[PDB]
Amino acid sequence: TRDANGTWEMESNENFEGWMKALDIDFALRKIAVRLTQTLVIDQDGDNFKVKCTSTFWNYDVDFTVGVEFDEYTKSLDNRHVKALVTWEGDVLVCVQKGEKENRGWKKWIEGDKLYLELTCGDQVCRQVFKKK
Ligand SMILES: *C/C=C(C)/C=C/C=C(C)/C=C/C1=C(C)CCCC1(C)C
């Protein structure tokens, strides 16, 4: 339940546009992002994670150590500085990103070869489901 290693292919993505709009992503870009197939690759070594979410010309990468606050600059997204922190709440991997936006972060629930990812910003939640390839 705590092993997120692998290559994960998207099965579903709900409220992606509402969450992107809460982050202030350009409206024109949102209409492109909605079309792009996403692949999520996670390398997890103890507390050390490398997360890479990739598409045709738009990627999001983040590396972190569980329990260690880090400065995150969302250079490929909304271009903001947040103080990010990833922790385990039971078997849920929880990220809080402290900064301008309220309720900003993400959570992963790993259920075998399924990964549920919820991205939050403001009053918006984006719900994604991936299957391990
Ligand atoms: C644990 C997994 C996480 C935190 C994955 C996060 C992925 C993203 C924030 C992806 C964002 C993207 C866009 C908003 C537009 C299109 C390109 C993406 C998929 C990289």
From Swiss-Prot:
Q: Does the keyword Cell inner membrane apply?
A: no
Q: Which UniProt keywords apply?
A: Cytoplasm, Retinol-binding, Transport, Vitamin A
InterPro entries, from UniProt?
Calycin, Fatty_acid-bd, ILBP, Lipocln_cytosolic_FA-bd_dom
Question: Per its UniProt record, what SUPFAM superfamilies does this chain match?
Answer: Lipocalins (SSF50814)
GO CC, sorted alphabetically, is: cytosol; nucleus
Q: Which residues bind all-trans-retinol?
A: L40, K108
Q: In which tissues is it expressed?
A: Higher expression in adult small intestine and to a much lesser extent in fetal kidney.
Superkingdom field: Eukaryota
GO MF terms listed in the record are: fatty acid binding; molecular carrier activity; retinal binding; retinoid binding; retinol binding
Q: Member of which family?
A: Belongs to the calycin superfamily. Fatty-acid binding protein (FABP) family.
- Its biological function? Intracellular transport of retinol.
Per the record, the domain comment is: Forms a beta-barrel structure that accommodates hydrophobic ligands in its interior.
Know the name of this protein? Answer: Retinol-binding protein 2
